[PDB]
Amino acid sequence: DNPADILVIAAYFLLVIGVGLWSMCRTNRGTVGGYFLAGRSMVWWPVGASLFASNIGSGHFVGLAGTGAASGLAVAGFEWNALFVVLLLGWLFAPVYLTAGVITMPQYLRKRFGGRRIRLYLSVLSLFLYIFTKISVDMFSGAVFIQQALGWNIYASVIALLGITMIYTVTGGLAALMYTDTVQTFVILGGACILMGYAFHEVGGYSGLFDKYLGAATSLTVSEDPAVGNISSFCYRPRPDSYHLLRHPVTGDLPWPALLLGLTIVSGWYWCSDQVIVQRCLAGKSLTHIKAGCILCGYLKLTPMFLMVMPGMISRILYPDEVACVVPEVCRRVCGTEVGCSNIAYPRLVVKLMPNGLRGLMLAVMLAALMSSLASIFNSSSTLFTMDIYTRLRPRAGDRELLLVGRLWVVFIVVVSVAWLPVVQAAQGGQLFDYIQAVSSYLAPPVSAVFVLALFVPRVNEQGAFWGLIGGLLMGLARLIPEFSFGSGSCVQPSACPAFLCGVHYLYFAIVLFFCSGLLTLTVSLCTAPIPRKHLHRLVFSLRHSKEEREDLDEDISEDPSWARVVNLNALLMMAVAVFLWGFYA
Amino acid sequence: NLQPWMQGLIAVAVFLVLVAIAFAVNHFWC
Ligand SMILES: OC[C@H]1O[C@@H](c2ccc(Cl)c(Cc3ccc(O[C@H]4CCOC4)cc3)c2)[C@H](O)[C@@H](O)[C@@H]1O
Ligand SMILES: *C(=O)CCCCCCCCCCCCCCC
């Protein structure tokens, strides 16, 4: 099909297997610390590249580009909030998780509160959140990229992709995945930078982009279907806030208070609390190296704006009648959906803007991002299931058995994702991305609050945490069931949900659910038994450095002050740069 | 006209002030 693209992807696979087998020769497998924690032998650059590579994915490319096309810049906030919470992790949550010596976050709640129902319920919630908000993202986005760019078939494609990533995460463990995440982050950044350069050159540069976007509206607005007719001149034209990152608090998608607060909550979960990112930060050689990896991942998390959001706007510039279409039949003829065809921004940029060798390179960038994210999810899920369930159910099992347990759990989660693929194919346009951020906002905030109080409030107890979690779950479902039931649609076909339900954006609901769950924990804790202090040494941010003995209701973080000053300084510098970029883009 | 690279400096300024006060309370309150 392509002479040079074949060799470029071959060299990509070559580097992949090379770093993989280099780590095999260096893996030191046979212990859970090896397979689930890389033996805690990871340094700054692989930790940072692993965080970035696992978080970045096909979902980021397709979603950020399509949203930039349809709406405008604002969606970049999703990425940039990470730059703060990641630091919170590296400086607040990772030290505790290190000085507690846990392999999972449910394990941390198991040995910080005490009991078998918190660990169980949180592991189950984490698994479901991974199936809904993470694997569906990447499967959907690889599906779109293949359906447009290549378009030979979509089931076979993503099934093969999951097969290769299954083999990858089975063989690897944390060491392989973090070294090959160095090489994959290199690949992703290089390719995406080249494509950004080409797009800026074709539009005429930053200035050429900021000039032509608000006039990037489609011309075909008839809708021969008599129901819609002459379209509002409001939903086929770009928003006048397309160039702004802080939209209106009420009459604007992604309102700024929602952005800041709600993403801080959901992202405190997404980084500081969930097993994927923390487990990237548990395989660290030391604490200082983990902080270095956090600053690196943050600096890279300032990147996906210019590499995914602005290219989507460029797509709307060059192909407005095809990505910015509104008319149901037109968009259906262009993509197959009748909701806007915004997702085709990045794939059509790649297909119509770059030559053969760079066609291969872009396919490799997409492949690397999807593989790294799925490998992260599968290994972290292996960690969670193996440790929590298999220990609560078979507390005396050899590591030659636990390795087997995790290895097979990878196969099972792959089969589950293949089974759930059609339920993901039933979403249209941006609907999936909305749905997933909504799921997170409904189900994350209680977990977020529980971890905040676990690390920062000694008082809370088993009743505290369990009842906050259950109350948060019921409150979240109260809104998720009806809202998801009524359906979804665009200006052409808007679903008839009540305004008091749909009118409150899911991030404001995340704030309210956060506060309800936190208040409920504090309430039902302050009117029940407390937990003594002897149980909480090296389990709360107050007692990090305690050397005294713990009661174990069921370390040695000494960073040299010099490198500590260095990593502190450049972390603060990273935040200064991120805050600048927030200001520059409104 | 308030250009965006002015907003950037304003945001950096308020961030620097916030961090300076945080380090002050660390130095005194710990
Ligand atoms: O869960 C919040 C965390 O999500 C992680 C993450 C998860 C999935 C996806 Cl796909 C993305 C990218 C994206 C694509 C399309 C989008 O469009 C939205 C907005 C309105 O329309 C729907 C939004 C985000 C990011 C962010 O990396 C982390 O920073 C956040 O803390
Ligand atoms: C304390 O004395 C034990 C029993 C607690 C009963 C009262 C709880 C008050 C909670 C107020 C916040 C509710 C948030 C929404 C929950 C669905």
XYZ file of C-alpha atoms and ligand atoms in Angstrom:
664
model
C 0.000 0.000 0.000
C 2.823 2.380 0.971
C 6.596 1.820 0.425
C 8.051 4.189 3.056
C 5.296 4.168 5.697
C 5.858 0.421 6.073
C 9.528 0.957 6.939
C 8.795 3.833 9.336
C 6.269 1.771 11.304
C 8.695 -1.168 11.135
C 11.421 0.955 12.731
C 8.903 2.076 15.350
C 8.076 -1.543 16.225
C 11.829 -2.157 16.175
C 12.537 0.485 18.822
C 9.558 -0.792 20.828
C 10.822 -4.367 20.963
C 14.404 -3.178 21.456
C 13.640 -1.225 24.614
C 11.309 -4.001 25.744
C 13.963 -6.704 25.506
C 16.597 -4.373 26.949
C 14.348 -4.121 29.998
C 13.770 -7.903 29.944
C 17.538 -8.396 30.165
C 17.389 -5.875 33.048
C 13.884 -6.648 34.368
C 14.685 -8.805 37.426
C 11.262 -10.451 37.383
C 9.821 -13.043 39.777
C 8.753 -10.649 42.553
C 5.588 -8.551 42.642
C 7.798 -5.520 43.207
C 9.271 -6.272 39.804
C 6.160 -6.914 37.770
C 3.848 -4.430 39.507
C 6.450 -1.827 40.536
C 9.512 -2.294 38.237
C 11.371 -3.165 41.425
C 11.029 0.527 42.320
C 14.038 1.087 40.047
C 12.706 3.943 37.895
C 14.290 7.376 37.517
C 13.032 10.805 36.508
C 12.921 10.620 32.710
C 11.082 7.257 32.449
C 8.680 8.200 35.260
C 7.749 11.460 33.550
C 7.553 9.909 30.109
C 5.413 7.107 31.553
C 2.946 9.483 33.196
C 2.594 11.516 30.002
C 2.496 8.533 27.625
C -0.133 6.687 29.699
C -2.362 9.751 30.107
C -1.957 10.877 26.482
C -3.815 8.656 24.063
C -5.808 8.433 20.866
C -8.644 9.922 22.900
C -6.613 13.064 23.433
C -5.819 13.507 19.730
C -9.335 12.914 18.410
C -11.276 14.574 21.225
C -9.122 17.678 21.611
C -8.975 18.203 17.840
C -12.705 17.695 17.311
C -13.641 19.946 20.215
C -11.235 22.620 19.015
C -12.918 22.411 15.616
C -16.500 22.543 16.906
C -16.088 24.793 19.951
C -12.644 26.369 20.273
C -9.684 26.481 22.619
C -11.388 25.977 25.993
C -11.072 22.167 26.107
C -7.305 22.626 26.618
C -8.139 23.252 30.274
C -8.683 19.506 30.686
C -5.000 18.962 30.037
C -3.676 21.978 31.885
C -5.397 21.204 35.183
C -3.253 18.039 35.245
C -0.172 20.235 35.450
C -1.325 21.358 38.888
C -2.791 18.167 40.325
C 0.223 16.184 39.154
C 2.346 18.403 41.384
C -0.115 17.848 44.237
C 0.437 14.121 43.708
C 4.203 14.382 43.597
C 4.318 16.511 46.724
C 1.364 15.281 48.796
C 0.043 11.867 47.807
C 3.060 9.995 46.439
C 5.175 10.562 49.616
C 2.440 9.076 51.788
C 1.887 6.229 49.324
C 5.632 5.627 49.432
C 5.924 5.801 53.208
C 2.966 3.419 53.521
C 4.562 0.906 51.150
C 1.340 0.060 49.322
C 1.002 -1.519 45.895
C -2.552 -0.154 45.470
C -4.842 2.651 46.633
C -7.516 0.250 47.929
C -4.668 -1.253 49.950
C -3.986 2.207 51.349
C -7.610 2.610 52.428
C -7.522 -0.956 53.782
C -4.641 -0.151 56.126
C -5.702 3.447 56.901
C -9.346 2.815 57.896
C -9.634 -0.941 58.472
C -12.151 -3.425 57.085
C -12.932 -5.424 53.937
C -15.804 -3.439 52.395
C -14.018 -0.155 51.612
C -11.201 -1.926 49.762
C -13.675 -4.124 47.899
C -16.060 -1.349 46.926
C -13.333 1.055 45.827
C -11.589 -1.600 43.753
C -14.888 -2.368 42.041
C -15.625 1.313 41.420
C -12.125 1.830 40.040
C -12.509 -1.085 37.642
C -15.831 0.253 36.375
C -14.447 3.782 36.025
C -11.565 2.386 33.989
C -13.956 0.473 31.720
C -16.217 3.484 31.172
C -14.051 6.601 31.222
C -10.736 5.270 29.859
C -10.915 2.193 27.622
C -14.042 3.386 25.821
C -12.257 6.682 25.065
C -9.282 5.063 23.357
C -11.265 2.379 21.546
C -13.678 5.002 20.181
C -10.868 7.302 19.082
C -8.756 4.629 17.406
C -12.000 3.548 15.755
C -12.581 7.045 14.353
C -8.980 7.487 13.222
C -9.058 4.181 11.371
C -12.571 4.679 9.972
C -11.479 7.908 8.307
C -7.734 7.692 7.646
C -7.615 4.048 6.518
C -11.181 2.766 6.699
C -10.685 -0.901 5.833
C -12.571 -2.094 8.954
C -13.006 -0.971 12.552
C -13.677 -4.074 14.678
C -10.728 -6.047 13.307
C -8.476 -3.008 13.674
C -9.109 -2.250 17.342
C -9.192 -5.972 18.192
C -5.709 -6.381 16.699
C -4.585 -3.256 18.555
C -5.817 -4.672 21.859
C -4.119 -7.984 21.058
C -0.715 -6.388 20.554
C -1.126 -4.256 23.685
C -2.212 -7.346 25.642
C 1.023 -9.103 24.699
C 2.928 -5.903 25.477
C 1.599 -5.446 29.012
C 1.803 -9.168 29.764
C 5.511 -9.345 28.954
C 6.501 -5.943 30.292
C 5.552 -4.968 33.807
C 6.350 -1.456 34.959
C 10.001 -1.430 33.877
C 9.388 -2.271 30.225
C 6.406 0.047 30.024
C 8.254 3.022 31.498
C 11.364 2.690 29.304
C 9.289 2.138 26.187
C 7.206 5.068 27.400
C 10.354 7.152 27.112
C 10.672 6.077 23.495
C 6.919 6.414 22.848
C 6.731 9.912 24.336
C 9.640 10.805 22.059
C 7.736 9.425 19.056
C 4.454 11.145 19.936
C 6.037 14.548 20.540
C 8.196 14.408 17.408
C 5.398 13.442 15.050
C 2.841 15.788 16.566
C 5.296 18.694 16.392
C 5.977 17.998 12.716
C 2.256 17.893 11.903
C 1.686 21.104 13.862
C 4.411 22.765 11.822
C 2.813 21.616 8.582
C -0.623 22.843 9.653
C 0.691 26.241 10.739
C 2.510 26.490 7.408
C -0.638 25.673 5.427
C -2.860 28.112 7.338
C -0.119 30.755 7.500
C 0.853 30.478 11.166
C -0.599 31.424 14.528
C -1.806 34.718 13.061
C -3.282 32.969 10.036
C -5.251 30.764 12.423
C -6.509 33.458 14.791
C -7.799 35.442 11.786
C -9.884 32.928 9.838
C -11.647 30.837 12.490
C -14.746 32.870 13.349
C -15.479 33.050 9.616
C -15.070 29.270 9.318
C -18.803 28.537 9.199
C -20.411 26.070 6.817
C -22.454 27.414 3.905
C -25.017 24.598 3.534
C -27.835 25.419 5.977
C -31.166 24.252 4.518
C -31.958 20.902 6.184
C -34.364 19.598 3.542
C -35.967 17.659 6.421
C -38.863 20.092 7.125
C -38.446 19.717 10.908
C -35.261 21.811 11.193
C -35.325 24.005 8.084
C -33.384 27.257 8.211
C -30.819 26.678 10.953
C -30.466 29.151 13.814
C -27.280 30.850 12.547
C -26.163 30.006 16.069
C -24.954 26.388 15.992
C -23.363 26.176 12.530
C -21.315 29.319 13.161
C -18.283 29.253 15.484
C -18.819 30.488 19.005
C -17.647 34.103 19.498
C -15.751 32.729 22.530
C -13.851 30.196 20.397
C -10.538 31.976 21.064
C -11.116 32.152 24.850
C -10.214 29.591 27.494
C -12.458 31.053 30.247
C -16.032 30.892 28.944
C -19.134 32.315 30.646
C -20.136 30.823 34.040
C -23.757 30.156 32.952
C -24.385 30.828 29.235
C -21.241 29.110 28.008
C -19.954 25.574 27.522
C -17.105 24.736 29.913
C -17.765 27.629 32.340
C -14.625 28.855 34.061
C -15.649 28.072 37.699
C -16.642 24.632 36.487
C -13.323 24.222 34.662
C -11.139 25.200 37.607
C -12.986 23.574 40.519
C -14.634 20.566 38.876
C -11.525 19.530 36.990
C -9.469 20.017 40.141
C -11.732 17.462 41.834
C -12.014 14.954 38.976
C -8.306 15.356 38.216
C -7.254 15.014 41.824
C -8.910 11.662 41.443
C -7.474 11.067 37.966
C -3.885 11.578 39.131
C -3.573 11.565 42.919
C -6.097 8.820 43.717
C -6.399 6.295 40.890
C -4.049 3.376 40.511
C -2.688 4.084 37.010
C -0.833 7.344 37.624
C 0.097 6.598 41.222
C 1.460 3.183 40.243
C 3.588 5.034 37.724
C 4.754 7.000 40.784
C 5.219 3.895 42.998
C 7.892 2.384 40.749
C 10.182 5.358 41.422
C 13.781 4.846 42.507
C 13.214 7.577 45.090
C 10.889 10.441 45.922
C 13.061 13.064 44.228
C 13.003 11.106 40.977
C 9.211 10.879 41.204
C 9.006 14.653 41.650
C 11.283 15.087 38.644
C 8.964 12.827 36.661
C 5.988 14.896 37.783
C 7.551 18.137 36.557
C 8.470 16.485 33.263
C 4.972 15.101 32.745
C 3.538 18.513 33.592
C 5.778 20.362 31.139
C 4.658 17.899 28.496
C 1.020 18.406 29.562
C 1.314 22.015 28.389
C 1.950 20.562 24.927
C -1.330 18.906 23.788
C -3.020 22.275 23.281
C -0.768 23.393 20.445
C -0.554 19.856 19.037
C -4.225 18.773 19.142
C -6.543 21.724 19.843
C -5.150 24.270 17.398
C -4.798 21.645 14.609
C -8.529 20.981 14.985
C -9.240 24.669 14.498
C -7.006 24.475 11.421
C -9.173 21.625 10.169
C -12.229 23.830 10.539
C -10.357 26.555 8.638
C -9.427 24.367 5.693
C -12.458 22.050 5.620
C -15.362 23.993 7.138
C -18.062 22.426 4.976
C -16.791 18.987 6.044
C -15.914 19.262 9.754
C -18.150 22.190 10.673
C -21.221 20.788 8.894
C -24.532 20.907 10.761
C -27.184 19.612 8.344
C -27.955 16.001 9.398
C -27.781 14.492 5.900
C -24.627 16.423 4.937
C -22.729 15.304 8.029
C -24.043 11.769 7.594
C -22.690 11.773 4.032
C -19.351 13.097 5.313
C -18.920 10.773 8.338
C -22.038 8.707 9.017
C -23.257 10.698 12.014
C -25.895 13.429 11.988
C -24.525 15.447 14.909
C -21.720 17.546 13.415
C -18.676 15.592 12.123
C -16.287 17.437 14.420
C -14.180 14.349 15.214
C -12.759 14.128 11.689
C -10.520 17.154 12.246
C -7.258 15.412 13.153
C -7.590 12.393 10.798
C -8.385 14.603 7.808
C -5.548 16.976 8.704
C -3.207 13.996 8.723
C -4.597 12.434 5.556
C -4.679 15.592 3.402
C -1.710 17.587 4.758
C 1.339 15.311 5.034
C 3.439 13.133 2.673
C 3.917 9.358 2.617
C 6.727 8.964 5.152
C 4.887 11.298 7.492
C 1.638 9.417 6.839
C 3.466 6.435 8.293
C 4.845 8.585 11.108
C 1.385 9.880 12.060
C -0.045 6.373 12.076
C 2.858 5.508 14.390
C 2.071 8.477 16.673
C -1.559 7.385 16.974
C -0.480 3.763 17.532
C 2.054 4.726 20.222
C -0.413 6.894 22.151
C -3.192 4.275 22.110
C -0.842 1.405 23.025
C 0.776 3.248 25.927
C -2.576 4.293 27.425
C -4.097 0.794 27.114
C -0.965 -0.853 28.512
C -1.123 1.476 31.504
C -4.796 0.716 32.130
C -4.325 -3.043 31.818
C -1.288 -3.212 34.113
C -2.883 -0.961 36.721
C -6.070 -3.019 36.615
C -3.947 -6.135 37.040
C -2.377 -4.557 40.114
C -5.740 -3.619 41.596
C -7.510 -6.924 41.036
C -4.593 -9.213 41.912
C -3.606 -7.454 45.127
C -7.030 -6.547 46.507
C -9.288 -9.429 45.512
C -6.786 -12.289 45.356
C -5.361 -11.380 48.769
C -8.739 -10.884 50.463
C -9.790 -14.242 48.940
C -6.528 -16.256 48.983
C -4.250 -14.516 51.492
C -1.502 -17.179 51.154
C -0.463 -17.464 47.501
C 3.024 -17.679 46.053
C 4.289 -14.936 43.791
C 4.595 -17.554 41.062
C 0.787 -17.559 41.470
C 0.209 -13.796 41.839
C 2.181 -13.115 38.661
C -0.114 -15.617 36.936
C -3.159 -13.898 38.431
C -2.215 -10.491 37.050
C -1.135 -11.889 33.691
C -4.516 -13.581 33.228
C -6.434 -10.533 34.451
C -4.922 -8.639 31.522
C -6.443 -11.174 29.116
C -9.803 -10.893 30.855
C -9.912 -7.081 30.808
C -9.013 -7.198 27.101
C -11.910 -9.559 26.391
C -14.205 -7.295 28.421
C -13.185 -4.231 26.406
C -13.764 -6.106 23.144
C -17.211 -7.034 24.468
C -17.990 -3.401 25.354
C -16.781 -1.987 21.992
C -20.249 -1.921 20.298
C -21.790 -0.065 23.253
C -19.122 2.544 22.528
C -19.793 2.469 18.777
C -23.406 3.454 19.570
C -22.337 6.978 20.559
C -22.131 9.642 17.850
C -19.801 12.593 17.436
C -18.629 14.189 20.665
C -21.341 12.417 22.670
C -18.895 9.855 24.013
C -16.454 12.444 25.342
C -19.302 14.271 27.077
C -20.599 11.030 28.525
C -17.227 10.064 29.922
C -16.450 13.362 31.590
C -19.999 13.200 32.990
C -19.432 9.701 34.381
C -16.248 10.907 36.051
C -17.946 13.972 37.524
C -20.715 11.829 38.991
C -18.569 8.987 40.325
C -15.175 10.586 41.020
C -15.954 13.335 43.614
C -16.728 10.980 46.530
C -13.493 9.086 45.989
C -11.660 12.398 45.673
C -13.101 13.603 48.978
C -12.381 10.302 50.716
C -8.705 10.440 49.747
C -8.459 14.118 50.702
C -9.811 13.366 54.181
C -7.862 10.123 54.544
C -4.602 11.943 53.953
C -5.500 15.199 55.734
C -8.144 14.375 58.391
C -7.120 11.726 60.971
C -10.613 11.664 62.502
C -12.520 9.924 59.694
C -13.121 6.182 60.099
C -14.556 3.106 58.360
C -18.134 4.341 58.799
C -17.053 7.807 57.647
C -15.499 6.640 54.412
C -17.908 3.818 53.578
C -20.996 5.971 54.071
C -19.523 8.926 52.203
C -18.785 6.584 49.315
C -22.245 5.000 49.288
C -23.993 8.361 49.631
C -21.908 9.775 46.812
C -22.727 6.749 44.671
C -26.469 7.090 45.255
C -26.396 10.845 44.659
C -24.407 10.368 41.459
C -26.695 7.657 40.134
C -29.732 9.804 40.989
C -28.685 12.169 38.200
C -26.818 9.736 35.942
C -29.761 7.371 35.407
C -32.344 9.920 34.168
C -29.882 12.129 32.287
C -28.356 9.181 30.447
C -31.856 7.770 29.890
C -33.434 10.785 28.176
C -30.743 10.679 25.478
C -28.462 13.212 23.843
C -28.529 15.430 20.775
C -27.365 18.640 19.136
C -29.144 21.815 17.993
C -30.484 19.790 15.062
C -31.866 17.056 17.365
C -31.711 18.077 21.039
C -32.966 15.523 23.546
C -35.800 16.633 25.830
C -34.230 16.478 29.285
C -35.495 18.918 31.955
C -33.443 22.064 32.444
C -33.082 21.528 36.204
C -31.368 18.232 35.298
C -29.411 19.086 32.135
C -28.976 22.804 32.861
C -26.518 22.162 35.710
C -23.222 21.266 34.031
C -21.672 18.034 35.267
C -18.677 19.845 36.786
C -20.871 21.932 39.096
C -22.523 18.650 40.052
C -19.030 17.305 40.736
C -18.423 20.166 43.163
C -21.765 19.582 44.887
C -21.229 15.820 45.060
C -17.705 16.331 46.386
C -19.079 18.523 49.142
C -22.048 16.289 49.980
C -19.812 13.227 50.271
C -17.163 15.049 52.306
C -19.774 16.526 54.627
C -21.394 13.124 55.085
C -18.076 11.482 55.980
C -17.233 14.192 58.505
C -20.732 13.964 59.991
C -21.009 10.196 60.358
C -17.429 10.131 61.658
C -17.707 12.845 64.315
C -20.706 11.008 65.868
C -19.069 7.551 65.968
C -15.931 5.995 67.425
C -12.592 7.616 66.499
C -9.475 5.725 65.408
C -6.419 5.985 67.720
C -3.241 7.664 66.547
C -1.111 4.529 66.928
C -2.711 3.074 63.790
C -1.882 6.025 61.515
C 1.915 6.390 61.493
C 3.186 6.841 57.917
C -0.437 6.740 56.702
C -1.385 10.440 56.866
C 0.432 13.521 55.605
C 1.005 14.527 59.233
C 2.859 11.288 60.054
C 5.033 10.829 56.944
C 8.341 11.075 58.805
C 7.302 9.171 61.944
C 9.823 6.399 62.609
C 7.878 4.894 65.532
C 5.977 1.621 65.195
C 2.494 1.233 63.701
C -0.219 -1.084 65.011
C -1.094 -2.340 61.481
C -4.914 -2.440 61.594
C -4.559 -5.233 59.018
C 9.796 3.890 53.346
C 12.805 6.036 54.379
C 12.058 8.999 52.103
C 15.233 11.061 52.603
C 15.832 13.200 49.522
C 19.150 15.046 49.512
C 18.394 18.746 50.184
C 20.379 19.920 47.130
C 18.506 17.975 44.458
C 15.396 18.687 46.534
C 15.980 22.410 46.030
C 16.547 21.843 42.311
C 13.369 19.823 41.735
C 11.274 22.156 43.910
C 12.579 25.127 41.921
C 11.831 23.781 38.470
C 8.420 22.485 39.619
C 7.510 26.016 40.681
C 8.886 27.286 37.372
C 6.637 24.851 35.525
C 3.632 26.206 37.405
C 4.686 29.754 36.594
C 4.768 28.841 32.903
C 1.387 27.088 33.050
C -0.196 30.071 34.793
C 1.308 32.308 32.117
C -0.250 30.199 29.391
C -3.616 30.328 31.168
C -3.382 34.115 31.218
C -2.193 34.427 27.612
C -5.187 32.410 26.373
C -7.693 34.334 28.533
C -6.037 47.222 24.389
C -4.950 44.570 26.912
C -2.931 42.138 24.799
C -2.742 38.484 25.914
C 0.965 38.626 26.783
C -0.020 41.238 29.365
C -2.556 38.855 30.896
C 0.222 36.277 31.051
C 2.410 38.588 33.115
C -0.504 39.493 35.401
C -1.209 35.813 36.077
C 2.482 35.118 36.697
C 2.559 38.082 39.084
C -0.356 36.913 41.208
C 1.039 33.359 41.217
C 4.416 34.634 42.446
C 2.691 36.610 45.203
C 0.692 33.557 46.288
C 3.823 31.404 46.478
C 5.730 34.091 48.392
C 2.988 34.265 51.027
C 2.900 30.457 51.221
C 6.631 30.371 51.938
C 6.221 33.143 54.518
C 3.632 31.132 56.449
C 5.917 28.086 56.219
C 8.829 30.109 57.609
C 6.769 31.441 60.529
C 3.951 28.951 61.193
C 5.733 25.898 59.698
O -11.210 13.310 33.816
C -10.489 14.532 33.825
C -9.131 14.173 33.381
O -9.273 13.811 32.022
C -8.011 13.329 31.551
C -8.599 12.900 30.309
C -9.491 11.719 30.143
C -10.194 11.367 28.837
C -10.015 12.327 27.660
Cl -10.829 12.006 26.113
C -9.226 13.555 27.833
C -9.035 14.509 26.628
C -10.305 15.249 26.263
C -10.997 15.017 24.903
C -12.305 15.750 24.496
C -12.974 16.635 25.520
O -14.202 17.323 25.242
C -15.017 17.366 26.485
C -15.161 18.544 26.868
C -16.666 18.890 26.393
O -16.924 18.020 25.491
C -16.472 16.797 26.182
C -12.301 16.861 26.870
C -10.972 16.154 27.253
C -8.528 13.841 29.176
C -7.294 14.608 31.452
O -6.092 14.315 30.763
C -6.970 14.968 32.782
O -6.303 16.224 32.653
C -8.219 15.343 33.416
O -8.039 15.660 34.772
C -24.132 11.058 63.107
O -24.653 11.450 64.186
C -24.591 9.679 62.491
C -25.831 9.728 61.556
C -25.843 10.871 60.497
C -27.250 11.352 60.089
C -27.291 12.792 59.536
C -26.427 12.999 58.282
C -26.370 14.448 57.766
C -25.671 14.553 56.406
C -25.770 15.940 55.725
C -25.216 15.985 54.271
C -26.002 15.114 53.270
C -25.422 15.061 51.842
C -26.283 14.234 50.849
C -26.463 12.745 51.232
C -27.329 11.950 50.243
